[PDB]
Ligand binder design. Structure first.
Ligand code: HEM
Ligand code: HEM
Ligand code: HEM
Ligand code: HEM
Lengths: 51, 380, 48, 297, 79, 125, 56, 80, 380
């Protein structure tokens, strides 16, 4: 924590922001695709009709 | 020409784990409880083997199959009451094992402790999930109350509770679900205990004094297998005193009616190892806060690797951390009594104050107690 | 006897089309990972 | 290095050794050597480097007197021509288990001389650095592959190289290791390479830029290696780059720049692998490729 | 028993190439079917006449059951 | 660049092998000019001989006619690839157009014998 | 650059882009494959199923 | 010695964009990687279908039965 | 920093087992059947785990619970027929693994083979204990015939018959006892598979050439993991074509009648994997000899490490032993065909000659073929 807070670790965290955020969207889109949420799948126009 | 216990590979891992494992010589009777949990899990598995051979799982004749076991099956009463009081023996050995783990500085065996609390979650789940299976009024309404308190979460709660029910209430699919789960879960508990022993045997065992025990080592055989046999004989003394003299004392007498959904018991109460869990769930007035206090109460002793602020390992040389540990187990006993008591003014304020004080001991006061130990012994 | 029968043939056709669209591709993945051993050429260089 | 040049550029003119094989030494007569002298020793493919102590007008008068009219026009107007050589990512492994120390090199094709990015691939190569077992830095050495290697006693030496040719280079690491830690050295080398390639820091690249500036001025200190730099720079770069322009190319390099052009020249690329010794605990080439590209990023 | 201490082999080299730089199917449909026919020729003389005799004893057993289930027209036809 | 093709080939002026040539390749070009000079001088001597009244017997054209006519079966070797591809190219479309002709004629004979197909004005069949 | 080279350079070289391509193609494969499989199933029996006899 | 070692003719195995020695492999490197990872991803979408759909069948089998769904609807109290 | 796969002990077990295992680069599609057996055993455990959530074991409603699985719960037909056809795939992969072990001369892994013989005992035990659980006519009378075969043991056999019966006939207690045994025995098979891997991993793995191949060794990952994935997908193609297209051709049709002791089927057979077992036990008219020949015909694979007389390990360079091995495979197929029909002319003669040929190929003919092989190939 105290050894993990610093300028170099903040720059490494800034370097690891977009791929971990994209992995978070991977987990969110995979959770949506696994559970088939009715609020979210009714907004995509390819699955717009009834499924 | 060659040694069989270091040549033959099953005998090599049996010899390394059981025969000349480097173990500290100064461990007390409280270190016997892990092997007591192993042999108690084995006697729960073998009594469940000889119990499920005459058990029929459906709500028309589950209780009739239980009474057929207790009356018409030869020596079936011994198997069923030995299984129930061996679940009680399993949980008092588990509670003394986790009290030893909170006491003697073994938070720091981190992967051992994390797969231990995964094992403890699975043991509590299979204990409730096998307590449904006699199909009494108390078992059915305890199943309804414990699964209905999982429905407090919005947007996933009613999907989760019709998923775990198989209907609008507890029924035939719920009982066969819980019997299949109660078969499958203690074998993955036993495999988790095997890899828990592997994560222990990576770094050996520890002493009551919190020191590096590498200077003084004895073999596990025959120095600890005869202490294992003595612990097994005193555990079988208390377990056989529980089955052959007081069979329904630790159990609930209200379970021994046929199950009826048209009426309710005058107070609803789960088992004695779930009483502190039910008191912590009853302490929070919000129901989602109660189930979050349930999950955080079981999971908060896994944060004890991260709550080691003291430079001394064990609590043997920590005198007021010992005071906070015995007031923690006093809060656990008061929680067990409060969960045994029904929901009345003023048991609720006693349960609220004792749950707040128990979370203050396990979260706040014991790290600052370790800080004031290392301040009073001039470490910094 | 079989109330699941039309759903059984529907899920069997879904399985057959997904495995026709899957099995040569994972055979190509196996042959792609095994091309190093399938073209691992050897030689002997004795010190004479 | 000769096995790596044989297995990295197979089927090309860069596969062969500088010395030539023993079946080709024994048939070299005088007329083939004077055909080679009449073809490849031509005058505008030749520079005259002097370094200090000279005067350039004196050298040009002496080159007018002596080294003028060597040979300019070819025999049948048959010009030699450089070709872009194919880099083939491959594996050669000479297994000699009675031999004591395993020398294993792993190299990716780098951009070469005339491409301007030899400074940024060299500053990545100098962040990775080098170690030999006579270095007394110990665990506290700055390069983390060398720190891990002396922490858990992996290898005797490792040397990270940027050997460059015209549009084709080998940049990689060659390690002298034992028979029991080639898997550890390969895993920690690819982990340090792509920890550099994913999470390069400003302190790491200013350490590398400082060690490159010191390495270039320590190379170009002496008269004989500065004449080596004058001849190699005049044959390859066209002009000779002064060290002020090398400093201006070094000072523009940052960690973001290093991260993307490392993603150009490092990430998911098939390397060439050579090994002489006990090469049993080298991983196979699919494990080299699975240990290249990262499970997180 | 790990890598490195398995066996001592000296003076061997092993050329290789990348998975990416070669075709995933190097001459499959032509020049793999001669290999399949050569392996089939190599092992079908030791596989096949047991399977010839299992089909022969299958045909013998089913034909003998079909003949023995049907009654004879010789005995108890003239009484 | 300009990508090559088997049907749209690389020209020799854009070819990379014309720009990195060797003295053995130049000696090969000199020997190709020498053999073209020998064949051209023999052809031109037979062209401008006035004692010649017949045509020019072209030996390479006789060689090409003999190779395309009466060398193929003396130079046959039976290989499995040639046997399988010749068996496919000599048998396959006969079974394919057999299936086409028999399917169409079974359809036509079935529709005539059931009465669905009508020959309205079909006098010359 | 050719046809697979640009999609390798922008959505296949990083593992997060690879998994996002896998998940987005998984959702599109779910809807398109279920539509195509039910289309070829109702083409292999139009009138035998409960759809197209539901007029009663 | 070491200089007599040459890698043999890999023309029967290698791809047609790598088969010429006058071209570099970095031009077709993205093409071969984007073909083989397309093969890998088109396998992995069917593997994700087989790991989603079978898990959904098992989860819906762990859910409530159709007989329980028929009996859970109450009797209609109607107009009177 | 440190290497996690060689540092973490739970990762060290999977690194020594499935990631960095020294495996030969030779091994064919026949060597994939061990991982296919492990994966299909795991999907049989998961499939029966999700099948026992609605199954009720009693003498009245077991067939009603099986048809409630088949048509009433959501998509339980796929799980039930997947369980039946995956038991068929379990025995397909087990018989081809046993045929691979006979095919490539891996009898020299003696304790590995003996642990495998104890797996084959336990797999046949849980398959017989699981075929009774749809309480049908074929299941009832097949369990009646096979558990009535144990009365041929003198002086203790009928006491063992009423011990495993729990009463005067096959009944409610027999069905619930076989349910308990059928649930518990694949975890014994899984622990025996763990010790099968443990006895394998020190002696190495065989190759089709049959040599000590430690010079040419490749890691298990990603080569044999991707060959495992390809084998899993072709095994799942044969398995899903077995469940969703041809679900009841391996299964007997008389299982789908409700069970009744008043009416017997005219032809009594088990499912297809026990047909060579029934062919062994129907050949001898002495039933104690049939039981002894059955236990000998399964245990003769365990005694097969002492019938390795040739100096070549694999059978691939032994053409006379290949002739005797493929006539052994065709004779086992003759046994599998002849076990399903009633004792008629000339089927008793065909089964008797097939049983004495099945014993004579293993006992005398293959060791004398190895001796003839060595004397013809100059090993004397
Ligand atoms: C119920 C099944 C359990 C079994 C069979 C079991 C088994 C064992 C065994 C055999 C030992 C070594 C003691 C000896 O042989 O002398 C041990 C120690 C240990 N166990 Fe467990 N254990 C169980 C539950 C748990 C749980 C739930 C935890 C987590 C709180 C845990 C944490 C530990 C720790 C930290 C030690 C090392 C300190 C000590 O030896 O007392 N165990 N266990
Ligand atoms: C895999 C091994 C096990 C099997 C096969 C098994 C099987 C059974 C069966 C059939 C019953 C119902 C009969 C009855 O009413 O007592 C039962 C009840 C029960 N089991 Fe288990 N069990 C096993 C392990 C355990 C373990 C490890 C625990 C402790 C956590 C446990 C706790 C209980 C409890 C509390 C009951 C209810 C006792 C009662 O009220 O009658 N079981 N078990
Ligand atoms: C219970 C089901 C079984 C499982 C899950 C199982 C599992 C495995 C596995 C994972 C392997 C290593 C992969 C390989 O090298 O093929 C293996 C190999 C082996 N198994 Fe089994 N096995 C089973 C049944 C048997 C039986 C019944 C035998 C005895 C005939 C046996 C004998 C062997 C032998 C001798 C090998 C090593 C040589 C070889 O693979 O060709 N296994 N088994
Ligand atoms: C521990 C995991 C297992 C459980 C809980 C289990 C449970 C069950 C249950 C409840 C049934 C009756 C439902 C039905 O299919 O009609 C059954 C049937 C059956 N099981 Fe298992 N089983 C397991 C593993 C296995 C294995 C490993 C085999 C293969 C040896 C197997 C072979 C069978 C067979 C042959 C049937 C009868 C199939 C039929 O005709 O319906 N089971 N099992």
């Amino acid at each position: 924590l105290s050894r993990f807070l610093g300028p170099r670790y903040r720059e490494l965290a800034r370097n690891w922001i977009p791929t971990a955020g994209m992995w978070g969207t991977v987990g969110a889109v995979g959770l949506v695709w696994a559970t088939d949420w009715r609020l979210i799948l009714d907004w995509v126009p390819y699955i717009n009709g009834k499924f | 020409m060659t040694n069989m216990r270091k040549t033959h590979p099953l005998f090599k891992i049996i010899n390394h784990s059981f025969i000349d494992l480097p173990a500290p010589s100064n461990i007390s009777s409280w270190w016997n409880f892990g092997s007591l949990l192993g042999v108690c899990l084995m006697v729960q598995i073998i009594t469940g083997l000889f119990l499920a051979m005459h058990y029929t799982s459906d709500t028309m004749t589950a209780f009739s199959s239980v009474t057929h076991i207790c009356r018409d099956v030869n020596y079936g009463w011994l198997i069923r009451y030995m299984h129930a009081n061996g679940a009680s023996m399993f949980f008092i050995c588990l509670f003394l094992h986790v009290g030893r783990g909170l006491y003697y500085g073994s938070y720091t065996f981190m992967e051992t402790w994390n797969i231990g609390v995964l094992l403890l979650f699975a043991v509590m789940a299979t204990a409730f999930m096998g307590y449904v299976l006699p199909w009494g009024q108390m078992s059915f309404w305890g199943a309804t109350v414990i699964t209905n308190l999982l429905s407090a979460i919005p947007y996933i709660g009613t999907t989760l509770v019709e998923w775990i029910w198989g209907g609008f209430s507890v029924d035939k699919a719920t009982l066969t679900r819980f019997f299949a789960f109660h078969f499958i879960l203690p074998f993955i508990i036993a495999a988790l205990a095997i890899v828990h022993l592997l994560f222990l045997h990576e770094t050996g065992s520890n002493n009551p004094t919190g020191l590096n025990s590498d200077a003084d080592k004895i073999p596990f055989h025959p120095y600890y297998t005869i202490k294992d046999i003595l612990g097994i004989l005193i555990m079988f003394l208390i377990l056989m005193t529980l089955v052959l003299f007081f069979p329904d004392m630790l159990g609930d007498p209200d379970n021994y009616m046929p199950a009826n959904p048209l009426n309710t018991p005058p107070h609803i109460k789960p088992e004695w190892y779930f009483l502190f869990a039910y008191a912590i769930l009853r302490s929070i007035p919000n129901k989602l806060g109660g189930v979050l206090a349930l999950i955080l109460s079981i999971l908060i002793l896994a944060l004890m690797p991260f709550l080691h602020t003291s430079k001394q390992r064990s609590l043997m040389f920590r005198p007021i951390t010992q005071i906070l540990y015995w007031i923690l187990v006093a809060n656990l006993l008061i929680l067990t009594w409060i969960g045994g008591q029904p929901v009345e003014h003023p048991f609720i304020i006693i349960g609220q104050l004792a749950s707040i004080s128990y979370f203050s001991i396990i979260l706040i006061l014991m790290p600052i107690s370790g800080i004031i130990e290392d301040k009073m012994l001039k470490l910094y | 006897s079989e109330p699941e029968h039309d759903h059984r043939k529907r899920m069997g056709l879904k399985m057959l089309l997904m495995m026709g669209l899957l099995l040569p591709l994972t055979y190509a993945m196996k042959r792609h990972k095994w091309s190093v051993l399938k073209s691992r050429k050897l030689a002997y260089r004795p010190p004479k | 290095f000769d096995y790596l040049h044989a297995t990295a550029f197979q089927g090309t003119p860069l596969a062969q050794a500088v010395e030539g094989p023993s079946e080709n030494v024994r048939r070299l007569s005088r007329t083939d050597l004077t055909d080679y002298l009449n073809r490849h020793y031509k005058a505008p493919r030749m520079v005259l480097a002097a370094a200090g102590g000279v005067e350039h007008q004196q050298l040009l008068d002496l080159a007018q007197k002596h080294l003028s009219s060597v040979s300019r026009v070819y025999e049948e107007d048959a010009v030699p021509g450089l070709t872009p050589c194919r880099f083939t990512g491959s594996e050669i492994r000479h297994r000699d288990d009675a031999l004591p120390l395993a020398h294993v090199a792993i190299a990716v094709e780098g951009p070469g001389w005339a491409n301007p990015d030899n400074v940024t691939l060299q500053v990545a190569n100098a962040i990775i650095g080098h170690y030999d077992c006579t270095y007394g830095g110990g665990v506290h050495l700055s390069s983390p592959l060398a720190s891990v290697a002396v922490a858990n006693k992996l290898c005797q030496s490792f040397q990270t190289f940027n050997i460059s040719y015209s549009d084709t280079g080998l940049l990689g690491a060659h390690f002298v290791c034992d028979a029991m830690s080639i898997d550890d050295m390969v895993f920690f080398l690819q982990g340090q390479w792509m920890r550099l390639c994913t999470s390069a820091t400003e302190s790491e690249v200013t350490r590398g830029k400082n060690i490159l500036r010191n390495a270039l001025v320590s190379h170009l200190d002496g008269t004989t290696p500065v004449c080596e730099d004058i001849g190699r720079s005049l044959l390859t770069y066209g002009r000779r780059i002064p060290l002020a322009e090398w400093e201006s190319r070094i000072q523009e390099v940052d960690a973001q720049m290093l991260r993307d052009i490392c993603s150009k020249y490092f990430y998911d690329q098939c390397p060439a692998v050579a090994g002489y010794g006990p090469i049993e605990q080298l991983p196979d080439y699919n494990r080299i490729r699975s240990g290249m590209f990262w499970l997180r990023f | 028993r790990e890598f490195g201490n398995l066996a001592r082999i000296r003076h061997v080299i092993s050329y290789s190439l990348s998975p990416f730089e070669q075709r995933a199917f190097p001459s499959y449909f032509s020049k793999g079917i001669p290999n399949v026919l050569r392996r089939t020729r190599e092992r079908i003389l030791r596989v096949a006449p047991p399977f010839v005799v299992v089909y022969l004893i299958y045909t013998w057993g089913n034909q003998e059951f079909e003949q023995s289930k049907r009654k004879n027209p010789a005995m108890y036809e003239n009484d | 660049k300009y990508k090559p093709a088997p049907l749209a080939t690389l020209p020799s002026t854009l070819d990379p092998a014309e720009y990195d040539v060797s003295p053995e390749t130049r000696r090969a070009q000199v020997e190709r000019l020498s053999i073209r000079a020998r064949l051209k001088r023999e052809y031109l001597l037979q062209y401008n001989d006035p004692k010649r009244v017949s045509h020019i017997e072209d030996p390479a054209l006789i060689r090409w006619t003999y190779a395309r006519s009466a060398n193929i079966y003396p130079n046959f070797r039976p290989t499995p690839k040639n046997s399988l591809l010749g068996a496919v190219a000599g048998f396959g479309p006969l079974i394919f157009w057999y299936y086409v002709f028999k399917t169409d004629r079974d359809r036509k004979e079935r529709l005539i014998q059931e009465g669905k197909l009508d020959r309205k004005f079909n006098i010359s069949y | 650059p050719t046809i697979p080279s640009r999609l390798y350079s922008l959505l296949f070289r990083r593992t997060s882009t690879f998994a996002l391509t896998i998940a987005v193609g998984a959702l599109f494969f779910e809807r398109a494959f279920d539509q195509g499989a039910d289309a070829i199933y109702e083409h292999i029996n139009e009138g035998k199923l409960w759809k197209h006899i539901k007029h009663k | 010695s070491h200089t007599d070692v040459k890698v043999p003719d890999f023309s029967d195995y290698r791809r047609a964009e790598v088969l010429d020695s006058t071209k570099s492999s970095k031009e077709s490197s993205e093409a071969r990687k984007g073909f083989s990872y397309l093969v890998t991803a088109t396998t992995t979408v069917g593997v994700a279908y087989a790991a989603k759909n079978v898990v959904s069948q098992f989860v819906s089998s762990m859910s409530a039965s159709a007989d329980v769904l028929a009996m859970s609807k109450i009797e209609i109290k109607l107009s009177d």
